[PDB]
């Protein structure tokens, strides 16, 4: 463990804001359309986070044009530029897998100040 952490230490990002599963987030991804570079945005609710080290990932749920979409990211990629927390949610567990079988108003998460 400590030989691996030392090698991988110099590649962890330091500008990562704190968030939990349940919060809403805007990810500033990076797309390459031929030679062009460009930035998209992907707005949704964080539903997963499974971790320990450079190997940390999270996933975001969204509903686009009547179909639900999920996108998982590593925490430390340089191919993301920004993670912004928009709201805070009141939640009671770590994996919000029950959201993937609800729609509209049943899938509502209450807000909370922090």
Partner 1 sequence: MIQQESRLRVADNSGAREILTIKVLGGSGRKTANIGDVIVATVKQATPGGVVKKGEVVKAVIVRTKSGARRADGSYIKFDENAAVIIRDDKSPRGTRIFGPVARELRENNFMKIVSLAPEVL
Partner 2 sequence: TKGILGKKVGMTQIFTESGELIPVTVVEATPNVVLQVKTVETDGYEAIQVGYQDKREVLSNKPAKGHVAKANTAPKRFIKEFKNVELGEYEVGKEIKVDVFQAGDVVDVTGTTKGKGFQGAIKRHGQSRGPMSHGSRYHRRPGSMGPVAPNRVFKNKRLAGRMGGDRVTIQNLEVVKVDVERNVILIKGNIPGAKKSLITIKSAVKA
Q: What is d(CA 112, CA 24) in angstroms, rounded to the nearest whole number?
A: 12
CA dihedral 41, 88, 12, 35 (to 10 degrees): 0
Which of residues 3 and 106 has its CB atom nearest to partner 2 in the complex? 3
Six-digit token string for 67: 């179909």
Interaction residues for partner 2, span 73-102 (CB under 8 A) = 74, 76-79
SS3 55: helix
Interaction residues for partner 2, span 4-33 (CB under 8 A) = 4, 6-8, 11
The interface partner of residue 6, options being partner 2, RNA, partner 1, none and the CB cut-off 5 to 8 Å by kind, is partner 2
From 1, 39, 45, select the one nearest 19 (Cα to Cα).
Answer: 45
What's phi and psi for 30, nearest 5 deg? -140, 125
Q: Which of 9, 55, 77, 82 binds RNA (CB under 7 A)?
A: 55
Q: How far is the CB of 40 from partner 1 (least distance, A)?
A: 9
The interface partner of residue 7, options being RNA, partner 2, partner 1, none and the CB cut-off 5 to 8 Å by kind, is partner 2
């Amino acid at each position: 463990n400590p030989l691996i952490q030392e090698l991988t230490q110099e590649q962890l990002r330091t500008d990562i804001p704190a968030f939990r599963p349940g919060d809403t987030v805007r990810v500033h991804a990076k797309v390459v359309e031929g030679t062009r570079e460009r930035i998209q945005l992907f707005e949704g609710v964080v539903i997963k986070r499974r971790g320990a080290g450079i190997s940390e990932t999270y996933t975001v749920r969204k509903v686009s044009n009547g179909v639900g979409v999920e996108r998982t990211f590593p925490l430390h990629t340089p191919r993301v530029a920004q993670i912004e927390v928009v709201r805070y949610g009141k939640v009671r567990r770590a994996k919000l897998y029950y959201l993937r079988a609800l729609h509209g108003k049943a899938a509502r998460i209450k807000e909370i100040r922090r």
